[PDB]
Design a binder for these strands. Structure first.
Ligand SMILES: [Ca+2]
Ligand SMILES: [Ca+2]
Ligand SMILES: [Ca+2]
Ligand SMILES: [Ca+2]
Length: 511
DNA sequence: GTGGATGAG
DNA sequence: GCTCATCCAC
């Protein structure tokens, strides 16, 4: 073309962390540590990534390494089923709390699958701890935050990164990177770097054409290009290419410092980034160009329900509501509402007004159908750019145990379990304080339980701290008094043995 | 006040 | 399955 398709404003926009995600030149990453629980146990027990590990809770498999998947094992399988698929399976139980003790521990070489009756982890008197995964997630998160200035913690084992600053900075100021033995960026991009410092452009002017020398610049990972398009055709391609290099460096830090492999999707938007991290795993990187977005969305493996908020009941409703086909629903959406989001909105408004439509149980807000259309229209085209928002404060934290047998036949038994709940909630508070770098302290505790006949009893009240800080023991004593109060409440009523018992903390002062 | 519904997968 | 924090019609 005469010039680039993009304006200076959209390139400069990369440098601002609150607006970068809105640029069509945005460069987002979704990084996933696959089979995370399996990885954590793998690395703790000195084992390799090719070792067929499964993370286990009782008789069920909660994480399955990819090495174990080569044998047709999945989470659907019980441990005994998986062992008929691979007799060399290395099942590793989660850490456990013992009823009445305030600490968790690992019992390696103990489990339901080991034949010795001496070496069992009884479900009745034990509770699973997930602290080891929490802790390890936090290490990862620390490394990510060091490497990048906008990081979103999407889950226990997944993050999003905004690479805009890093990319824009590389593009304009990195004098050390070189495309070949003889070629470096400072010389490759001299025109763009000199126009920019010059300041003579107008922010709405289009960028100049990419120079030929840059075209040699390499992508790291798997560039998704079914149609064999040109790899570098415009600035969004240059940025994405630089991002991939940067992104490979980060992932190597994770693997070098902690030993965890990752999957990674690289693209313009969050949603497209997540689809990409899942396209090939484990230990793979997938790049999706803006020009290949439709090639990617329509490759066959995706549907409207494949997107982040639509994998559930709303998604299924939408398929019905919109009369979409079970195949190629994304394409179907693009063409049936080809020109603007509004068409979809109106179509939505009528169906909203249809006779069959249930206002009472619908997951579609009729007041907010402006936003719904937009998300669909742009998600369909892969241009739905959400920001990397931070997770909002916790309102509530809960620890509980589903009880079977008579593990809870008296006040004393309940109190042994409350010790485990405090210990667990205490360490989770600690994780939060690190996440926030702010002191977190709950003011309200709530004890609840289900009786022999599944009736619910509950007591909430304030917890008062003899000190300025939070002391776990204060939490337990209130837990104990509520447990005692509800005992009195159920004397000649259905009660023991209990079927469920919980501790919930709320009303946090984040200070 | 909260049981049950909701999201990944 | 199942886990979890969170939201809101009842
Ligand atoms: Ca994951
Ligand atoms: Ca004790
Ligand atoms: Ca996950
Ligand atoms: Ca292009």
């Amino acid at each position: 073309g005469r010039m680039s398709k993009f304006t200076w404003k959209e390139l400069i926009q990369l440098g601002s962390p609150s607006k970068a995600y809105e640029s069509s030149l945005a460069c987002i990453a979704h990084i996933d540590m696959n089979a995370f629980f399996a990885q954590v146990e793998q690395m703790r027990c000195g084992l390799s990534k090719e070792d067929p590990v499964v993370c286990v809770q009782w008789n069920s498999i909660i994480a399955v390494s990819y090495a174990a998947r080569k044998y047709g094992i999945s989470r659907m399988d019980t441990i005994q089923e998986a062992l008929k698929k691979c007799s060399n399976l290395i099942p590793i139980h989660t850490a456990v709390f013992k009823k009445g003790e305030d600490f968790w521990q690992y019992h390696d070489g103990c489990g339901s699958w080991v034949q010795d009756p001496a070496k069992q982890i009884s479900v009745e008197d034990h509770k699973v701890s997930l602290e080891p995964y929490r802790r390890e997630s936090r290490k990862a998160l620390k490394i990510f935050k060091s490497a990048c200035d906008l990081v979103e913690r999407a889950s226990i084992d997944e993050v999003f990164l905004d690479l805009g600053r890093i990319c824009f900075n590389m593009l304009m100021f990195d004098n050390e990177y070189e495309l070949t033995g003889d070629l470096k960026l400072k010389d490759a991009l001299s025109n763009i770097r000199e126009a920019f410092i010059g300041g003579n452009y107008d922010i709405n002017s289009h960028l100049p054409l990419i120079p030929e020398k840059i075209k040699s610049l390499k992508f790291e990972g798997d560039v998704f290009n079914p149609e064999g398009r040109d790899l570098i055709t415009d600035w969004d391609d240059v940025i994405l290419a630089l991002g991939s290099q940067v992104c490979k460096g980060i992932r190597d830090s994770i693997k070098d410092i902690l030993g965890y492999t990752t999957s990674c999707g690289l693209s313009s938007t969050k949603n497209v980034c997540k689809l990409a991290s899942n396209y090939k795993k484990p230990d793979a990187q997938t790049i999706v160009k803006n020009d290949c977005l439709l090639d990617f969305l329509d490759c066959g493996k995706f549907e409207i329900t494949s997107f982040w908020t639509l994998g559930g009941v709303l998604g299924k409703e939408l398929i019905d509501v919109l009369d979409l086909p079970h195949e190629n629903s994304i394409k179907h959406i693009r063409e049936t509402w080809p020109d603007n989001a509004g068409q979809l909105k109106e179509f939505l408004d009528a169906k909203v007004k249809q006779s069959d439509y249930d206002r009472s149980t619908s997951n579609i807000d009729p007041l907010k159908t402006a936003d719904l259309a937009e998300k669909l229209f742009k998600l369909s085209r892969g241009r739905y750019g959400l920001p990397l928002s931070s997770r909002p404060v916790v309102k509530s934290m809960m620890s509980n145990k589903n009880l079977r047998g008579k593990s809870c036949n008296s006040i004393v038994d309940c109190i042994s379990w409350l010790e485990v709940f405090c210990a667990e909630l205490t360490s989770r508070i600690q994780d939060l304080e690190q996440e926030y770098n702010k002191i977190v302290i709950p003011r309200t505790v709530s004890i609840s339980l289900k009786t022999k006949s599944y009736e619910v009893y509950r007591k909430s009240g304030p917890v008062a701290y003899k000190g300025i800080n939070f002391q776990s023991h204060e939490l337990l004593k209130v837990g104990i008094k509520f447990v005692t109060d509800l005992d009195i409440k159920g004397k000649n009523k259905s009660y023991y043995p209990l079927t469920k018992l919980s501790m919930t903390i709320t009303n946090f002062d984040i200070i």
